Each structure stands twice: as C-alpha cells, then as structure tokens.
C-alpha cells in the first residue's frame, strides 16, 4: 500500500527498497522565438533513485538526445524513467534487487508496473509523503555532473556522505530531507547557511560539508528556522 | 416454434424468459412457455419470491434437445432437465397446450431486441465458459465467480471467461512497453482476435454473453468481463472497420435494454467515459454515445 507517516519507519528496516523520483527527468527552458511564439529548449535531466537505508544513490543522467524527434515528452519521461529503473534492477545481482520501489509521484505507477512485469515479487508503491527530492539539482555536485554530461551516464553517490558512521539511517534520512526541504523553499538562503563558514569544506568524495556533530545541530536549526520563516511569508501568518 | 414445459410451480417465483418475465404464485398451475423462437440461444431464469437474493437460470437452445423445468424440493430450486424420449415429450407438451396452461413467448414482430442482444452468442461457446458437459444447457447464477476472480475457489462452478489483463506479459511485448500499453492494438488483434478467439464473432459472442449474465443475474464478474472487452477494443488505435460498426450496434441494444434503475452498479464510470470521450474510438460509437448521453448523462 501507500507510504505515509504511519509506516514511516519501514524505510529503515532491512528490506531493500528504493525511492524513485522523476521530477528532474525532463527539464526545459522556456523562451520566445523570433516570430514571438514560445518554445522550449530541453536540458539534461536525471532520475533520482535512492536507497534510504544505505544512502546509495543511482543518479541516471538523462541526456537531451533522448528526446530528439519525440512527441508528448512529459508522458515519455515517465516511461523512460520506468525503463531506466527496470534496467537498473536487471543489472543488480539478485540479492541486491529491491523488494519494493516507492515512486514519489503517482503517475509513475503504471509505467513502472508495466516495465517491472518480469519482477512480479517487487512491489511498486505510491506515497502520501511530500518528499523534497526535486531539490536534488540544488546539490552543486549533482547539478554539475548532470549539466556536463555528453551522453547517457549513470553516476553513483552516497547521499549521506559518511554520516552513517555516526548516526542511524532514520536520522540520516531526516537530515537529508530537511536540507532538501530548505533548499526547495529558499535555495539562496539554504546554500548560504551551508557554506557561510569557509573553514568547513566539502571532501572531494562528498556532497555536503564536513560539519562536526555540534555544527550539524546549529545547521539543522538554521534550516528549521529558514523553513518556518518562508511559511509565514508564503501565507501571511 | 418450440416449447419448454414445467412439471409444476410449487414455490412463488418470478420467471424470466429472455427479456420477458412473469409472476407465478405458489402452486399456480403454470406448465411452461411455448412459441419460443427457434434459431437463437435463450435463457430461462428465476427469482424466488422469498429470496430476492440469488437469481439463477439456464441458457439453452431447443435445437439441441427437448428441455423442461422441474422444481426440486431437496435442492430448493427450479432445475432444467432434458427428456430423451421424444414421443413422451411431445405428449406432455401437446396435452399442456390443449389445457392452455402455458404462456406464449411474447415477441412483437417488429422487435429485433433479442436478436441484437444475442447475434454472436452460440450455445457451443457458452458450454466452454460454463463447463458441465453432461447437460446441453448451462446454469448461471448471481453468485458464481469467474476464473480471473478466483486467481486474485471451486473451479467446477467457475465462469471460464477469457482472462484479459492490461498489465500482463500477455498484453505487453518486451521493448514495446509504452506502445502496447497506450495502444492495445497488438493485444486485441494478434493475441486475442487472431490468437484466442480466432475471429471477431466469437469475441463479440463472449462480450454479449457476459453482458446478459450481468444484466439477468447481477453477476459482478460478468460485468467486469464485459467492460474489459469493450475497453480493449476502445483502447486500440487499429480496429477493423467492420468491428467498430458492429460494436456500436451491440452496445446500443445493451444500453437500450438495461433496466433504468440499475445503471449504477452495471455501468463502470471510468471505462465508459474513457471509451466514449478519451479513447481512440471516441468518434466511432455514435449511436452508443447518443443513447448514453440522453439516458444516463449523470454517469458522464
């Protein structure tokens, strides 16, 4: 069934599962033509497939060539996502294949379900959570490798850096979603907060700065404050 | 013109023949239905005045033998049986007419309704969906489940309709996932028409039998099968023109014939709005669209 606040801890049990987010698969700019009509120009996109227990991220880069000569691209994007997720599952050894795939938007259920017919024992679930995974392209290194790609490419990351050496999955996921929530609500502030102090650097093999434990507490609170402020502004409360 | 005599009518029951029906009172001297039009399948059905649950009935074709109804006080229901003694049977039938204890199949000569509802229904195919090969007629009731329903318990009582499933390996060719799911033409024409049904008339026959079971018995799995077979056609971009034209006629007489008060459980909102307004074949059901609109605009 659907994923929500009730069954939220199932994400951190030992059943292998992946989140799939397709929000950044088909990305365009919108511009005016010489005659004054509107046109779109596609840019590179990505599928965000994430194991929330381990932090492993399977960043499937979607090169603009994929769209060439295709109609109804926003519909095609859902099927391409499902196609690439299915290929990812096929490429993994049996004991690594997930038991569940949770799609962050319900439009992906039928495409993925159809692409996964060869895996009848993998459950394709929707979710009621409002996960902020669209802000993945606010992580500088993720956006950089997507924008520079010259061909379809899969790039693997751990989206938790080394946090699990000191905290649980539950807490790691909560930190990630708080950072992404903030990046989504006010990217400029969020990034300011993360980088203000030039003495805290990002390891070449990491995505986020190497904060100490105390510094993560300050950061998380700064991200919390950011998010609540933006709410009052949005709604005049 | 053929006859189906009744040994007696011991319990108060509403009797249907095809789309007609009569109230018969406990121990009323009712002894059968005469003038039944030869050349079509037929269905005789029942609803006890005491259990408005469980409509049941028998599909038959008089060319396949001499059939009669008899109440069974052990099993508690009107049973169809076959009389193998041709002489003994004409004797019972002639005597009952003489005594004029039989109702006349009440066909208006202008009326092709039953023909239109049963055009492609052949007894031989019914007996493959309702497998009970010692009888030439087929029993169906409200409660019977379909093979597909069982999968998701007693297989002897099953409606062995053809399983249609849009999210199956059967429906979907590898590498044509998106194509075959958005355009079911492959599934319709290669897998089902050429593969399983062999021709369109057998397909339409199953579609029609499914509708009549839903209508006469409220069999919910038959309603599901009927909508599935419609949706499969309507969700295919490439359908023989002769099938589209016939489908509009088929659906027209089905919609025309449905009791007005049952549209809610018998008509699936999604499938119809999809077929009539979203599908490839939106523009090909002009008669069925006109009558749906003028009769059940609520559902749409």
Curated annotation (Swiss-Prot), chain A:
Role noted for this protein: Functions as a scaffold that mediates the ordered assembly of spliceosomal proteins and snRNAs. Required for association of BRR2 with the spliceosomal U5 snRNP, and the subsequent assembly of the U4/U6-U5 tri-snRNP complex. Functions as a scaffold that positions spliceosomal U2, U5 and U6 snRNAs at splice sites on pre-mRNA substrates, so that splicing can occur. Interacts with both the 5' and the 3' splice site, as well as the branch region. Has a role in branch site-3' splice site selection. Associates with the branch site-3' splice 3'-exon region. Also has a role in cell cycle.
Phenotype for residue 104 to A: Reduced growth at 30 degrees Celsius. Strongly reduced growth at 16 degrees Celsius
Effect of residue 21 to A: Alters protein folding. Severely impaired growth. Strongly reduced growth at 35 degrees Celsius
Subunit structure: Component of the U4/U6-U5 tri-snRNP complex composed of the U4, U6 and U5 snRNAs and at least PRP3, PRP4, PRP6, PRP8, PRP18, PRP31, PRP38, SNU13, SNU23, SNU66, SNU114, SPP381, SMB1, SMD1, SMD2, SMD3, SMX2, SMX3, LSM2, LSM3, LSM4, LSM5, LSM6, LSM7, LSM8, BRR2 and DIB1.
Residues of the full protein shown: 1836 to 2069 of 2413
Species this chain originates from: Saccharomyces cerevisiae (strain ATCC 204508 / S288c)
Domain of life the protein comes from: Eukaryota
Protein name: Pre-mRNA-splicing factor 8
Lineage, opening ranks: Eukaryota, Fungi, Dikarya, Ascomycota, Saccharomycotina
Domain notes: The MPN (JAB/Mov34) domain has structural similarity with deubiquitinating enzymes, but lacks the residues that would bind the catalytic metal ion. Contains a region with structural similarity to reverse transcriptase, presenting the classical thumb, fingers and palm architecture, but lacks enzyme activity, since the essential metal-binding residues are not conserved.
Misc. remarks from the entry: Present with 468 molecules/cell in log phase SD medium.
Region (RNase H homology domain): 7-237
Localization per record: Nucleus
Swiss-Prot record, chain B:
Location(s), subcellular: Cytoplasm; Nucleus
Gene Ontology biological process terms in this record: spliceosomal snRNP assembly; spliceosomal tri-snRNP complex assembly
UniProt entry keywords in alphabetical sequence: Cytoplasm, mRNA processing, mRNA splicing, Nucleus, Phosphoprotein
Region (Leucine-zipper): 244-265
InterPro entries given in the database record: AAR2, AAR2_C, AAR2_C_sf, Aar2_N, AAR2_N_sf
Phosphothreonine carried by residues: 257
Record Pfam families: AAR2, AAR2_1st
UniProt effect for mutating residue 236 to A: No effect on interaction with PRP8
Subunit composition and interactions: Heterodimer. Interacts with PRP8 (via RNase H homology domain and MPN domain), competing with BRR2 for the same binding site. Component of a U5 snRNP complex that contains at least the U5 snRNA, PRP8, SNU114, AAR2, SMB1, SMD1, SMD2, SMD3, SME1, SMX2 and SMX3, but is not a component of the U4/U6-U5 tri-snRNP complex.
Additional comment: Present with 7330 molecules/cell in log phase SD medium.
The protein's role, per its UniProt record: Component of the U5 snRNP complex that is required for spliceosome assembly and for pre-mRNA splicing. Involved in splicing pre-mRNA of the A1 cistron and other genes that are important for cell growth.
Name under which the protein is recorded: A1 cistron-splicing factor AAR2
Species of origin: Saccharomyces cerevisiae (strain ATCC 204508 / S288c) (Baker's yeast)
